[PDB]
Amino acid sequence: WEVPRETLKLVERLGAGQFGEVWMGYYNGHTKVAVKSLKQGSMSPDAFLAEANLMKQLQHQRLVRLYAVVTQEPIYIITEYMENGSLVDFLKTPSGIKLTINKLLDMAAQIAEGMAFIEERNYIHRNLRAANILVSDTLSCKIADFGLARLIEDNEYTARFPIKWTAPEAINYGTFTIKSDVWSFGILLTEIVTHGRIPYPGMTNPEVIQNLERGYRMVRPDNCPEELYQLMRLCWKERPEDRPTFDYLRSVLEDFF
Ligand SMILES: CN1CCN(c2cccc(-c3cnn4c3N=CC(c3ccc(O)cc3)[C@@H]4N)c2)CC1
DSSP states (O other): OBOOGGGEEEEEEEEEETTEEEEEEEETTTEEEEEEEEOTTSSOHHHHHHHHHHHHHOOOTTBOOEEEEEOSSSOEEEEEOOTTOBHHHHTTSHHHHTOOHHHHHHHHHHHHHHHHHHHHTTOOOSOOSGGGEEEOTTOOEEEOSOSOSSOOOTTSSSOOOOGGGOOHHHHHHOOOOHHHHHHHHHHHHHHHHTTSOOSSTTOOHHHHHHHHHTTOOOOOOTTOOHHHHHHHHHHTOSSGGGSOOHHHHHHHHHTOO
């Protein structure tokens, strides 16, 4: 997986944040890639490279594909390039805003498909939200930053804490399982149908927490199909055992229309 830095030309910076940068570049002259580079001192090379190791372990059409790593300073992780960047941002563009419910649900289904694979392999995401989904030129969706031992923020590698996607038992006890990812997925569905609106709009993180102690659930978003809302409400059942599998979520979303 290790390559000489010479095999890579970084062309254009796509973002910079607290822990490093992401660039568009070319690999072996012809392959368009994205390159995540570590800012020295942010974390150890091993902590950074764990993300690459997880992409080695889990390969799937709905998961972001690893091409290579460079393990001398600055450390690089090299992946496939996704023309439409992060789903959370794409949804806010002219093209994104004009997507039909049909196409949005196809995208939700692809995300449930990738999560169904993670579930079947007995991994967890822990960081599931529209920010961590990448979108290709043909609107195919790929899950990034899965299986990490840590919770990530959106400003680490671009200019911009994810309490709003976190299930109650994870807030209260630090219990993270595939069922807390199912919770996060229900929140992600609200992002998809509102063309990228922040969850619990006009609540701060502490207010969300106070509301969840009282059993609060977001209302049906404007224009959201009622059946899709009922799917959301299943993802948000208080007890993790009452939440559906991703296998089921995928099957419902795939055949939705
Ligand atoms: C016209 N478009 C051009 C591309 N733009 C854009 C903006 C921000 C990120 C991306 C973009 C495209 N691909 N990727 C991106 N961001 C992070 C990636 C990544 C890299 C390494 C890693 O370990 C995990 C994830 C990745 N593959 C693309 C969006 C607008």
